[PDB]
Design a binder for this molecule. Structure first.
Ligand SMILES: Nc1nc2c(ncn2[C@@H]2O[C@@H]3COP(=O)(O)O[C@H]4[C@@H](O)[C@H](n5cnc6c(=O)[nH]c(N)nc65)O[C@@H]4COP(=O)(O)O[C@H]3[C@H]2O)c(=O)[nH]1
Ligand SMILES: Nc1nc2c(ncn2[C@@H]2O[C@@H]3COP(=O)(O)O[C@H]4[C@@H](O)[C@H](n5cnc6c(=O)[nH]c(N)nc65)O[C@@H]4COP(=O)(O)O[C@H]3[C@H]2O)c(=O)[nH]1
Length: 36
């Protein structure tokens, strides 16, 4: 009805669309969390 998993951004408001993670990803990266 109302669980955790909540991200609040100015243009996006709602739960995180991320649930998959490929360390063998072949293509352009654009996620802030991909920074060391
Ligand atoms: N198709 C696709 N594009 C990807 C993916 N990962 C990153 N991107 C792209 O990278 C951009 C990073 O925007 P940001 O302002 O640095 O930072 C992001 C981020 O901080 C936040 N944000 C919005 N939606 C999400 C979300 O579902 N998850 C997370 N973790 N942050 C989000 O709002 C900012 C603006 O997001 P956008 O305008 O959507 O812009 C996103 C999006 O176009 C992915 O897996 N698939
Ligand atoms: N490290 C990294 N991996 C990336 C990036 N863009 C795509 N991927 C990978 O490619 C898959 C396909 O993304 P999609 O078809 O754009 O579809 C994405 C996208 O539409 C959405 N999404 C997630 N986070 C964001 C975000 O921050 N912004 C936007 N606009 N969409 C997001 O969630 C969907 C999840 O797709 P999946 O097939 O489960 O998993 C994602 C993810 O494993 C990226 O910038 N960095």
């Amino acid at each position: 009805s109302k669980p955790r998993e909540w991200v609040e951004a100015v243009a996006y408001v709602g739960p995180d669309r991320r649930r998959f993670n490929s360390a063998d990803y072949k293509g352009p990266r654009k996620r802030k969390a991909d920074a060391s």
